[PDB]
């Protein structure tokens, strides 16, 4: 009824487990927070910030309309916000 | 072994879940996505 | 795009003087509008009389013009029909009728400006959606 | 040997090919009345003025319908929730125009179906069984009550109950979405999980038992002949089933107790369907699905549409068109 | 005793999570499909492909986030990261919809790996492979809906986007444009899913209420041993109850459990066939005899004609925002509307 | 004698590590204002 | 040998611990009553209608006459505070006794005293406990009569002048009226007991119910069940529980319809308008608007050929047109001034509509009980802005849900009580399977 690995309930009630993980779990949580709070997540993924969906007096969507010039269309849309 | 009683581990983890979920529901009324 | 002073700049009176609201005033106006007005005027229409909306071009053609802070502040005190011919305080919320419309009781003079300011700003932001009804939802 | 005692012995007899019982005494006339009226109306009823606006809808085969478009049409909005038996009409012609048969069918049917649930308890008691098969059936029964009775009460009219027809069903669920956004309501979401999960677990349990049948036949025979009705030994190896399914996922995600397994099979779709029946029953009082229309706006205040806004455009299209002649004022408040 | 057999040994070790030869295909593809969906719903927009916000970062909740389809202008491009559209730029690849094909394609190969896993474990354990066979129904549904259907249309844009509300929009699109509820292949699918759920509940309930008393406790679960040879419930009493309640009942335990496999599997296969038709707009949209009569006879009205009016409102009211690449401008005066509303 | 690092160990952290990372990022997002 | 998840069934035969469970649980009920009232009061803002503020308990107190004056305006919130505090305080005492009897007190009562101890199978003792509680309930029904007639009265939405607190001096005692309600059909235009539309019938009904309950309590103290009743029932703790579960389910369904349709003991001033009311108010609103513009509402033919504003009901009464034709059975104090013998009176409509009636219809039309789960007001296609779901929707839906599940609990516990009484609740005896001794069906 077992395949040789250490039981989970034995692991998570053990002191050594919680010695390591009271650091690793908050560290990963803080790291993810800073990914957003530093604004890095916006730049990695290309996600618009609340002020960069539209140019100031614009109400047209910057919809991609060409297949092979698509990359350049996005880039041109973005310069209309600089 | 069995130092930390499992009923205590479950209580604390459970409250950690409640806190994060509660934070997510708070954010439905503030900031982005709140309609304000 | 963002809430800049140019969008926050609206007419003060008929003579053409302008006033520039703060972002705080805009947000306060939106809150007070939801508190006291939105039940009939959500999104700039009028549920109990759809023929009359809060679009700026509509308010400009009202008698006393209402497309300016003064005209709107006066309306919240002594509302009239669209042609100016009769006072309608007893069927429309106003300070003059805060006894029969209790939500008007605790509105101070600066609240009135915030509420008027919101009504004039919003069509600049939402365009056709303000006062357009479900066609533009 | 008394005449009443012998009748009581026949009613509750476990020897009738079909059990009658005291619940059967109410069920049999009510279901026969509902069935006979349904068949006749479906084939032959004239058009019914469902929305009270003197615009009759043709439901029956003889008036130009096929099996897919035919319906018994709900009773007139002019009647609302008023009781409309035959003897309240000036004539059968009047009763037919106004949708009388719908009321007769659904009232007799809800009674007979309720007694069907009671009859399930009753025979279980005469046979010495455990009693809760009727609790499983309460989930479909509650659903039928929701669409034929509860939702009418909340909206104020049997004309808004579900039509007794295939396309009439579709009309009902399209209008239900435009007015309640039922897709965005969590009790319908749980109903889908009850029904998707139910079909899943049906296929799983069927495939796992079938996978582990003990060899009892030749390749020229149906393996089904390896089981004889009323044999005492099991016909499959649950240990082999568990040994496979536990390795497919991991060991503790698989059942090796057949009683807990079958209880799980019972409870998942039953509970899911209770919730979706409660969804219809609480949207009867206009507590509707989540509304995230224009919930996302940018720094200036432009609306940033989400998929919820696209749904709303679809809902709007259904709203403006349904019952295109029935509304004179701008808000559809029921 | 070469390297191949050594590796075979290690892949087939009995461990907490069985690996197997199929694990080499299954595990990477399952993890990337899942990770793609979590990454995109947390961080990635749909602004440039759809004009929609769609991530937690943008303000969306669990019901509204999605990994959305590429823009219509991409056609059926594979949208590979290194391909001519994104040209190796990860950021542009996200903005152009590349996570959608990433998830659909890795998802497709993970499904294959999972079915191979069912075959692989069944062979090592010694059982018949009917669980794998039943899993062909989920695969048929996935490939017909996410692959075949958009491949018959103009582009991936019209496939389902991976999100809760995005799938709801897919449902309503199919009503207004395809009249999918009228399609007998969907109706057969409905009967298979609903009939599956019924069989699931009725079989579970029957077993639990014909149990043998094999212990003294009021909790009846303890009175079962997985190695007992005896049936734990009475087929004879179950058959009598249902024969007298419903008129017919199961009498053969093997047929019953095969029927439980057959019903939902067959239903899903049927619905898949109808979606293949809709790939080509081969809809069951109309009944011609109804339309001929209704066009000539303005007093003739059915629930069929009522529903088409509802489809026509759906199309006109959602199309401009739902298909933004078409630049549909519908002035207020052309929108179909009943009175007052 | 229990091993520490197993195939199971990898499967567990392959899911749990980015899960907590993602939960931290989503928490921060609740305090973003427009 | 119940499992932990059925662990409260271990209390069936431990009368002392089961007493603690009941009394502790009663402390929970009173605690929530106390705490919820203080919460509502802390959030209450008097210049907003109660129904714009998500209040469900303050409306119950206001209906009893406390805190309000003419038109339903709140004059004094101190009565609300008192009701909350006293409930909250009382919950400590019930909490104290509950935990004592559940943890420290005697596990079983029948040793400590032959008065408080009981056996479920003792039909004499069971009807005695029932009789005591019937008397308690009878006193409870007369407290409401006392408040209405001797201690300040009740809020009366029908009082001339827009509603007001009114002392009830002539409660209805005619049993043809009181029991006439119990024989009205539950269908539209009748509405069974939900149709009660005046305080005199309400107070008189409670005099009758108080007396009936006290008389019935004394009956059951002094008698034991007759043989016909002894052969018809199961006599066990779980059976008694199952019977009460059925009664609570029935009662919850009734309460659902009461708050949805009745605007007399659920005044719309406090609870917001009913569904029918709000839909009638919209037709009133545009009738008023269009007639001010010159429209002749009586002769205006709508698109279908039916009147655009006014039409006839199936029995001829003049009623509002449009879809609200279904709601013509609605009666409310803002509308009744316009009714003559034949329904809505065209001459009153032309000449006698007052500004307060225009205000009230516009208010109720824009506060129809429609809203989303996240409290966006209006139809499902409305945009965000108005934070509102009517108290009537909250109360109708919650109690339908509770009523439904208690019907399921009735089925569960009734079937089990039967099977446990006959001895096959744990399964079929392999050596004595009934079907194996029956002839085959074919
Ligand atoms: C079950 C088993 C388990 C399944 C596991 C599946 C995992 C494998 C996944 C495979 C991925 C397949 C993607 C193929 C992409 C595709 O098709 O890409 C599409 C391209 C064709 O491209 C399309 O071509 C169209 C027609 O163009 C032509 O017409 C135009 C108009 O005149 C112009 O002239 C244009 O220049 C000219 O080329 C449009 O341009 C579209 O925008 C453009 O996308 O075909 C091609 O790559 C190749 C197509 C021809 C080969 C067909 C292969 C079969 C695949 C389709 C089978 C389903 C059939 C559906 C029909 C219903
Ligand atoms: C023991 C077994 C019992 C078996 C009994 C067998 C017969 C049962 C009858 C049930 C059928 C109920 C139909 C209700 C129809 C309806 O119009 O019912 C509503 C009526 C209230 O009627 C309304 O009552 C109103 C009263 O208001 C009037 O008076 C008010 C006074 O202020 C206002 O002024 C208002 O404006 C004015 O109209 C009007 O008369 C309306 O026209 C009228 O519709 O409620 C009622 O009588 C109150 C009770 C209704 C209970 C129905 C709930 C059923 C729940 C089923 C649950 C299914 C569970 C599934 C199982 C698994
Ligand atoms: C079994 C695992 C597996 C499978 C089946 C896939 C399958 C796929 N991936 Mg995924 N991927 C995987 C693991 C896997 N991936 C892993 C582990 C990662 C992390 C690095 C990724 C990261 C990833 C990304 C980032 C992308 C894909 C993409 C794709 C698709 C296109 C791949 C392609 O064209 O292959 C081409 C390569 C081959 C077919 C292999 C060729 C091997 C031949 C037989 C030998 C050739 C000889 C060799 C070249 C000689 C070199 C000599 C040298 C000295 C010069 C396809 C659905 C793309 C996608 O989803 O598009 C939307 C994409 O953009 N994958
Ligand atoms: C309204 C809810 C409610 C109530 C009143 C009870 C009451 C009871 N249960 Mg039940 N139970 C409930 C819910 C409830 N249960 C639920 C939801 C479950 C499922 C998890 C169970 C599962 C369960 C099992 C499995 C068993 C019981 C048993 C019992 C009884 C003895 C418990 C005991 O000795 O604990 C001892 C516990 C302690 C000493 C811990 C301290 C608990 C105290 C009371 C907390 C009080 C805090 C409060 C703030 C005090 C205020 C002080 C101030 C007012 C003075 C008791 C009458 C047992 C029984 O029948 O005994 C034969 C038993 O075996 N119950
Ligand atoms: C349903 C409620 C209920 C019932 C049936 C019992 C029954 C019992 N209790 Mg328990 N008890 C209860 C509630 C209840 N108690 C509460 C609420 C508390 C907390 C204050 C206690 C605290 C308590 C203690 C501390 C002890 C008992 C004991 C006893 C036993 C002897 C009682 C006796 O001789 O009193 C004789 C009769 C009287 C003293 C007359 C009391 C008159 C009351 C208080 C006034 C009337 C109240 C009114 C009707 C309603 C409240 C008003 C409110 C609405 C504002 C008996 C089995 C004793 C025991 O078991 O010994 C081992 C014991 O030591 N009880
Ligand atoms: C909580 C309330 C309550 C409860 C649980 C009981 C319980 C009991 N009573 Mg008591 N009873 C009560 C209040 C209560 N009583 C009151 C207040 C009075 C004074 C009027 C009486 C007067 C009384 C008498 C005179 C008798 C009982 C008897 C009984 C026993 C048999 C009951 C029975 O078979 O009914 C089942 C009901 C029937 C068989 C007939 C049903 C008839 C109704 C009207 C059907 C209608 C239901 C319908 C669907 C809903 C619409 C209602 C309609 C009226 C509009 C049982 C122990 C009997 C006994 O043994 O006494 C010692 C007996 O003869 N009771
Ligand atoms: C007056 C009400 C009442 C009373 C006193 C009882 C009493 C009893 N029931 Mg019954 N029951 C009731 C109503 C009631 N029931 C209702 C309404 C239903 C239908 C749903 C049932 C269905 C039912 C079943 C199916 C069974 C019982 C059983 C039992 C016994 C054991 C109960 C136990 O230990 O539970 C322990 C308590 C728990 C395990 C807690 C359950 C947790 C609930 C379901 C979730 C609550 C969450 C809530 C909805 C809000 C969520 C928000 C979130 C923050 C939590 C006991 C005699 C058992 C039995 O037959 O014993 C003889 C049994 O198997 N009951
Ligand atoms: C750009 C490329 C990106 C991807 C590159 C490809 C990377 C894929 C690597 C996949 C292998 C990772 C799993 C093995 C890790 C491990 O700990 O096992 C090796 C060791 C395990 O310890 C042992 O564990 C054993 C049990 S088990 O095999 O782990 O189940 C036990 O037998 C033994 O005694 C114990 O010491
Ligand atoms: C895409 C991509 C990739 C990949 C990535 C990955 C793989 C990712 C992963 C990711 C992940 C892996 C993530 C995760 C996350 C998670 C989450 C976010 C979770 C959450 C959850 C929750 C929230 C829950 C809660 C709850 C509830 C609600 C109830 C019950 C209880 C519980 C607690 C469960 C790469 C690099 C290759 C490159 C290309 C691109
Ligand atoms: C048995 C049991 C149980 C149960 C229990 C119970 C349920 C209990 C109860 C209890 C209770 C029920 C309690 C109560 C309490 C109360 C109190 C203690 C109160 C206090 C009060 C106060 C102090 C107040 C104050 C105030 C005032 C006076 C004024 C205003 C303000 C304030 C509010 C602050 C359980 C399940 C857990 C477990 C198992 C066993
Ligand atoms: C307060 C009030 C009032 C009054 C009321 C009254 C006067 C009532 C009464 C009520 C009553 C007086 C009721 C009764 C009930 C009854 C019932 C509910 C019954 C039940 C039954 C049963 C359940 C049975 C069963 C059975 C059978 C059938 C067979 C054999 C077996 C058994 C026994 C099981 C009014 C409306 C004026 C107004 C408002 C307020
Ligand atoms: Cl329609
Ligand atoms: Cl209307
Ligand atoms: Fe089975």
mmCIF file with all atom_site columns, N, CA, C and O in Angstrom, chain D residues 244-273:
data_model
loop_
_atom_site.group_PDB
_atom_site.id
_atom_site.type_symbol
_atom_site.label_atom_id
_atom_site.label_alt_id
_atom_site.label_comp_id
_atom_site.label_asym_id
_atom_site.label_entity_id
_atom_site.label_seq_id
_atom_site.pdbx_PDB_ins_code
_atom_site.Cartn_x
_atom_site.Cartn_y
_atom_site.Cartn_z
_atom_site.occupancy
_atom_site.B_iso_or_equiv
_atom_site.pdbx_formal_charge
_atom_site.auth_seq_id
_atom_site.auth_comp_id
_atom_site.auth_asym_id
_atom_site.auth_atom_id
_atom_site.pdbx_PDB_model_num
ATOM 1   N N  . UNK D 1 244 ? -5.663  -0.033 -11.420 1.00 0.00 ? 244 UNK D N  1
ATOM 2   C CA . UNK D 1 244 ? -5.515  0.749  -12.645 1.00 0.00 ? 244 UNK D CA 1
ATOM 3   C C  . UNK D 1 244 ? -5.783  2.231  -12.388 1.00 0.00 ? 244 UNK D C  1
ATOM 4   O O  . UNK D 1 244 ? -4.958  3.091  -12.726 1.00 0.00 ? 244 UNK D O  1
ATOM 5   N N  . UNK D 1 245 ? -6.941  2.559  -11.795 1.00 0.00 ? 245 UNK D N  1
ATOM 6   C CA . UNK D 1 245 ? -7.310  3.971  -11.713 1.00 0.00 ? 245 UNK D CA 1
ATOM 7   C C  . UNK D 1 245 ? -6.396  4.736  -10.769 1.00 0.00 ? 245 UNK D C  1
ATOM 8   O O  . UNK D 1 245 ? -6.091  5.909  -11.015 1.00 0.00 ? 245 UNK D O  1
ATOM 9   N N  . UNK D 1 246 ? -5.968  4.096  -9.674  1.00 0.00 ? 246 UNK D N  1
ATOM 10  C CA . UNK D 1 246 ? -4.998  4.715  -8.796  1.00 0.00 ? 246 UNK D CA 1
ATOM 11  C C  . UNK D 1 246 ? -3.661  4.966  -9.466  1.00 0.00 ? 246 UNK D C  1
ATOM 12  O O  . UNK D 1 246 ? -2.934  5.879  -9.086  1.00 0.00 ? 246 UNK D O  1
ATOM 13  N N  . UNK D 1 247 ? -3.308  4.163  -10.467 1.00 0.00 ? 247 UNK D N  1
ATOM 14  C CA . UNK D 1 247 ? -2.062  4.461  -11.156 1.00 0.00 ? 247 UNK D CA 1
ATOM 15  C C  . UNK D 1 247 ? -2.275  5.494  -12.243 1.00 0.00 ? 247 UNK D C  1
ATOM 16  O O  . UNK D 1 247 ? -1.354  6.261  -12.551 1.00 0.00 ? 247 UNK D O  1
ATOM 17  N N  . UNK D 1 248 ? -3.487  5.540  -12.808 1.00 0.00 ? 248 UNK D N  1
ATOM 18  C CA . UNK D 1 248 ? -3.804  6.538  -13.825 1.00 0.00 ? 248 UNK D CA 1
ATOM 19  C C  . UNK D 1 248 ? -3.668  7.953  -13.273 1.00 0.00 ? 248 UNK D C  1
ATOM 20  O O  . UNK D 1 248 ? -3.188  8.856  -13.971 1.00 0.00 ? 248 UNK D O  1
ATOM 21  N N  . UNK D 1 249 ? -4.073  8.159  -12.018 1.00 0.00 ? 249 UNK D N  1
ATOM 22  C CA . UNK D 1 249 ? -3.961  9.447  -11.340 1.00 0.00 ? 249 UNK D CA 1
ATOM 23  C C  . UNK D 1 249 ? -2.882  9.305  -10.267 1.00 0.00 ? 249 UNK D C  1
ATOM 24  O O  . UNK D 1 249 ? -1.687  9.416  -10.556 1.00 0.00 ? 249 UNK D O  1
ATOM 25  N N  . UNK D 1 250 ? -3.301  9.071  -9.022  1.00 0.00 ? 250 UNK D N  1
ATOM 26  C CA . UNK D 1 250 ? -2.437  8.526  -7.977  1.00 0.00 ? 250 UNK D CA 1
ATOM 27  C C  . UNK D 1 250 ? -3.344  7.783  -7.002  1.00 0.00 ? 250 UNK D C  1
ATOM 28  O O  . UNK D 1 250 ? -4.570  7.928  -7.041  1.00 0.00 ? 250 UNK D O  1
ATOM 29  N N  . UNK D 1 251 ? -2.731  6.969  -6.132  1.00 0.00 ? 251 UNK D N  1
ATOM 30  C CA . UNK D 1 251 ? -3.462  5.914  -5.422  1.00 0.00 ? 251 UNK D CA 1
ATOM 31  C C  . UNK D 1 251 ? -4.653  6.461  -4.638  1.00 0.00 ? 251 UNK D C  1
ATOM 32  O O  . UNK D 1 251 ? -5.758  5.902  -4.684  1.00 0.00 ? 251 UNK D O  1
ATOM 33  N N  . UNK D 1 252 ? -4.441  7.542  -3.895  1.00 0.00 ? 252 UNK D N  1
ATOM 34  C CA . UNK D 1 252 ? -5.439  8.031  -2.952  1.00 0.00 ? 252 UNK D CA 1
ATOM 35  C C  . UNK D 1 252 ? -6.514  8.875  -3.616  1.00 0.00 ? 252 UNK D C  1
ATOM 36  O O  . UNK D 1 252 ? -7.445  9.315  -2.936  1.00 0.00 ? 252 UNK D O  1
ATOM 37  N N  . UNK D 1 253 ? -6.412  9.096  -4.922  1.00 0.00 ? 253 UNK D N  1
ATOM 38  C CA . UNK D 1 253 ? -7.475  9.714  -5.692  1.00 0.00 ? 253 UNK D CA 1
ATOM 39  C C  . UNK D 1 253 ? -8.450  8.686  -6.261  1.00 0.00 ? 253 UNK D C  1
ATOM 40  O O  . UNK D 1 253 ? -9.362  9.062  -7.007  1.00 0.00 ? 253 UNK D O  1
ATOM 41  N N  . UNK D 1 254 ? -8.286  7.405  -5.912  1.00 0.00 ? 254 UNK D N  1
ATOM 42  C CA . UNK D 1 254 ? -9.135  6.321  -6.391  1.00 0.00 ? 254 UNK D CA 1
ATOM 43  C C  . UNK D 1 254 ? -9.861  5.657  -5.225  1.00 0.00 ? 254 UNK D C  1
ATOM 44  O O  . UNK D 1 254 ? -9.357  5.621  -4.102  1.00 0.00 ? 254 UNK D O  1
ATOM 45  N N  . UNK D 1 255 ? -11.057 5.133  -5.506  1.00 0.00 ? 255 UNK D N  1
ATOM 46  C CA . UNK D 1 255 ? -11.905 4.486  -4.509  1.00 0.00 ? 255 UNK D CA 1
ATOM 47  C C  . UNK D 1 255 ? -11.627 2.990  -4.468  1.00 0.00 ? 255 UNK D C  1
ATOM 48  O O  . UNK D 1 255 ? -11.593 2.332  -5.510  1.00 0.00 ? 255 UNK D O  1
ATOM 49  N N  . UNK D 1 256 ? -11.477 2.436  -3.272  1.00 0.00 ? 256 UNK D N  1
ATOM 50  C CA . UNK D 1 256 ? -11.502 0.990  -3.156  1.00 0.00 ? 256 UNK D CA 1
ATOM 51  C C  . UNK D 1 256 ? -12.657 0.506  -2.299  1.00 0.00 ? 256 UNK D C  1
ATOM 52  O O  . UNK D 1 256 ? -12.793 -0.706 -2.100  1.00 0.00 ? 256 UNK D O  1
ATOM 53  N N  . UNK D 1 257 ? -13.491 1.407  -1.790  1.00 0.00 ? 257 UNK D N  1
ATOM 54  C CA . UNK D 1 257 ? -14.733 1.035  -1.130  1.00 0.00 ? 257 UNK D CA 1
ATOM 55  C C  . UNK D 1 257 ? -15.871 1.277  -2.113  1.00 0.00 ? 257 UNK D C  1
ATOM 56  O O  . UNK D 1 257 ? -16.120 2.421  -2.520  1.00 0.00 ? 257 UNK D O  1
ATOM 57  N N  . UNK D 1 258 ? -16.562 0.201  -2.481  1.00 0.00 ? 258 UNK D N  1
ATOM 58  C CA . UNK D 1 258 ? -17.659 0.296  -3.439  1.00 0.00 ? 258 UNK D CA 1
ATOM 59  C C  . UNK D 1 258 ? -18.846 1.085  -2.883  1.00 0.00 ? 258 UNK D C  1
ATOM 60  O O  . UNK D 1 258 ? -19.550 1.756  -3.646  1.00 0.00 ? 258 UNK D O  1
ATOM 61  N N  . UNK D 1 259 ? -19.072 1.041  -1.567  1.00 0.00 ? 259 UNK D N  1
ATOM 62  C CA . UNK D 1 259 ? -20.190 1.798  -0.996  1.00 0.00 ? 259 UNK D CA 1
ATOM 63  C C  . UNK D 1 259 ? -19.949 3.304  -1.064  1.00 0.00 ? 259 UNK D C  1
ATOM 64  O O  . UNK D 1 259 ? -20.850 4.058  -1.443  1.00 0.00 ? 259 UNK D O  1
ATOM 65  N N  . UNK D 1 260 ? -18.743 3.767  -0.733  1.00 0.00 ? 260 UNK D N  1
ATOM 66  C CA . UNK D 1 260 ? -18.497 5.203  -0.822  1.00 0.00 ? 260 UNK D CA 1
ATOM 67  C C  . UNK D 1 260 ? -18.479 5.648  -2.268  1.00 0.00 ? 260 UNK D C  1
ATOM 68  O O  . UNK D 1 260 ? -18.911 6.762  -2.588  1.00 0.00 ? 260 UNK D O  1
ATOM 69  N N  . UNK D 1 261 ? -17.931 4.803  -3.147  1.00 0.00 ? 261 UNK D N  1
ATOM 70  C CA . UNK D 1 261 ? -17.925 5.104  -4.568  1.00 0.00 ? 261 UNK D CA 1
ATOM 71  C C  . UNK D 1 261 ? -19.343 5.329  -5.079  1.00 0.00 ? 261 UNK D C  1
ATOM 72  O O  . UNK D 1 261 ? -19.642 6.369  -5.689  1.00 0.00 ? 261 UNK D O  1
ATOM 73  N N  . UNK D 1 262 ? -20.246 4.382  -4.810  1.00 0.00 ? 262 UNK D N  1
ATOM 74  C CA . UNK D 1 262 ? -21.592 4.542  -5.347  1.00 0.00 ? 262 UNK D CA 1
ATOM 75  C C  . UNK D 1 262 ? -22.333 5.671  -4.650  1.00 0.00 ? 262 UNK D C  1
ATOM 76  O O  . UNK D 1 262 ? -23.154 6.333  -5.285  1.00 0.00 ? 262 UNK D O  1
ATOM 77  N N  . UNK D 1 263 ? -22.031 5.949  -3.369  1.00 0.00 ? 263 UNK D N  1
ATOM 78  C CA . UNK D 1 263 ? -22.632 7.126  -2.737  1.00 0.00 ? 263 UNK D CA 1
ATOM 79  C C  . UNK D 1 263 ? -22.170 8.397  -3.428  1.00 0.00 ? 263 UNK D C  1
ATOM 80  O O  . UNK D 1 263 ? -22.971 9.302  -3.690  1.00 0.00 ? 263 UNK D O  1
ATOM 81  N N  . UNK D 1 264 ? -20.875 8.482  -3.732  1.00 0.00 ? 264 UNK D N  1
ATOM 82  C CA . UNK D 1 264 ? -20.372 9.607  -4.509  1.00 0.00 ? 264 UNK D CA 1
ATOM 83  C C  . UNK D 1 264 ? -21.089 9.721  -5.850  1.00 0.00 ? 264 UNK D C  1
ATOM 84  O O  . UNK D 1 264 ? -21.436 10.827 -6.285  1.00 0.00 ? 264 UNK D O  1
ATOM 85  N N  . UNK D 1 265 ? -21.306 8.588  -6.532  1.00 0.00 ? 265 UNK D N  1
ATOM 86  C CA . UNK D 1 265 ? -22.014 8.639  -7.809  1.00 0.00 ? 265 UNK D CA 1
ATOM 87  C C  . UNK D 1 265 ? -23.405 9.229  -7.637  1.00 0.00 ? 265 UNK D C  1
ATOM 88  O O  . UNK D 1 265 ? -23.887 9.977  -8.496  1.00 0.00 ? 265 UNK D O  1
ATOM 89  N N  . UNK D 1 266 ? -24.074 8.892  -6.536  1.00 0.00 ? 266 UNK D N  1
ATOM 90  C CA . UNK D 1 266 ? -25.414 9.405  -6.303  1.00 0.00 ? 266 UNK D CA 1
ATOM 91  C C  . UNK D 1 266 ? -25.386 10.902 -6.001  1.00 0.00 ? 266 UNK D C  1
ATOM 92  O O  . UNK D 1 266 ? -26.164 11.675 -6.573  1.00 0.00 ? 266 UNK D O  1
ATOM 93  N N  . UNK D 1 267 ? -24.466 11.337 -5.144  1.00 0.00 ? 267 UNK D N  1
ATOM 94  C CA . UNK D 1 267 ? -24.586 12.668 -4.555  1.00 0.00 ? 267 UNK D CA 1
ATOM 95  C C  . UNK D 1 267 ? -24.185 13.779 -5.517  1.00 0.00 ? 267 UNK D C  1
ATOM 96  O O  . UNK D 1 267 ? -24.807 14.851 -5.506  1.00 0.00 ? 267 UNK D O  1
ATOM 97  N N  . UNK D 1 268 ? -23.148 13.552 -6.341  1.00 0.00 ? 268 UNK D N  1
ATOM 98  C CA . UNK D 1 268 ? -22.640 14.623 -7.199  1.00 0.00 ? 268 UNK D CA 1
ATOM 99  C C  . UNK D 1 268 ? -23.713 15.191 -8.118  1.00 0.00 ? 268 UNK D C  1
ATOM 100 O O  . UNK D 1 268 ? -23.948 16.414 -8.080  1.00 0.00 ? 268 UNK D O  1
ATOM 101 N N  . UNK D 1 269 ? -24.366 14.407 -8.984  1.00 0.00 ? 269 UNK D N  1
ATOM 102 C CA . UNK D 1 269 ? -25.374 15.025 -9.864  1.00 0.00 ? 269 UNK D CA 1
ATOM 103 C C  . UNK D 1 269 ? -26.627 15.442 -9.111  1.00 0.00 ? 269 UNK D C  1
ATOM 104 O O  . UNK D 1 269 ? -27.284 16.420 -9.495  1.00 0.00 ? 269 UNK D O  1
ATOM 105 N N  . UNK D 1 270 ? -26.978 14.730 -8.044  1.00 0.00 ? 270 UNK D N  1
ATOM 106 C CA . UNK D 1 270 ? -28.149 15.108 -7.270  1.00 0.00 ? 270 UNK D CA 1
ATOM 107 C C  . UNK D 1 270 ? -27.957 16.496 -6.679  1.00 0.00 ? 270 UNK D C  1
ATOM 108 O O  . UNK D 1 270 ? -28.814 17.380 -6.829  1.00 0.00 ? 270 UNK D O  1
ATOM 109 N N  . UNK D 1 271 ? -26.809 16.723 -6.034  1.00 0.00 ? 271 UNK D N  1
ATOM 110 C CA . UNK D 1 271 ? -26.548 18.025 -5.425  1.00 0.00 ? 271 UNK D CA 1
ATOM 111 C C  . UNK D 1 271 ? -26.424 19.108 -6.492  1.00 0.00 ? 271 UNK D C  1
ATOM 112 O O  . UNK D 1 271 ? -26.970 20.209 -6.342  1.00 0.00 ? 271 UNK D O  1
ATOM 113 N N  . UNK D 1 272 ? -25.703 18.822 -7.583  1.00 0.00 ? 272 UNK D N  1
ATOM 114 C CA . UNK D 1 272 ? -25.602 19.810 -8.646  1.00 0.00 ? 272 UNK D CA 1
ATOM 115 C C  . UNK D 1 272 ? -26.958 20.216 -9.189  1.00 0.00 ? 272 UNK D C  1
ATOM 116 O O  . UNK D 1 272 ? -27.201 21.394 -9.472  1.00 0.00 ? 272 UNK D O  1
ATOM 117 N N  . UNK D 1 273 ? -27.869 19.254 -9.323  1.00 0.00 ? 273 UNK D N  1
ATOM 118 C CA . UNK D 1 273 ? -29.162 19.586 -9.912  1.00 0.00 ? 273 UNK D CA 1
ATOM 119 C C  . UNK D 1 273 ? -30.083 20.297 -8.916  1.00 0.00 ? 273 UNK D C  1
ATOM 120 O O  . UNK D 1 273 ? -30.890 21.148 -9.317  1.00 0.00 ? 273 UNK D O  1
#
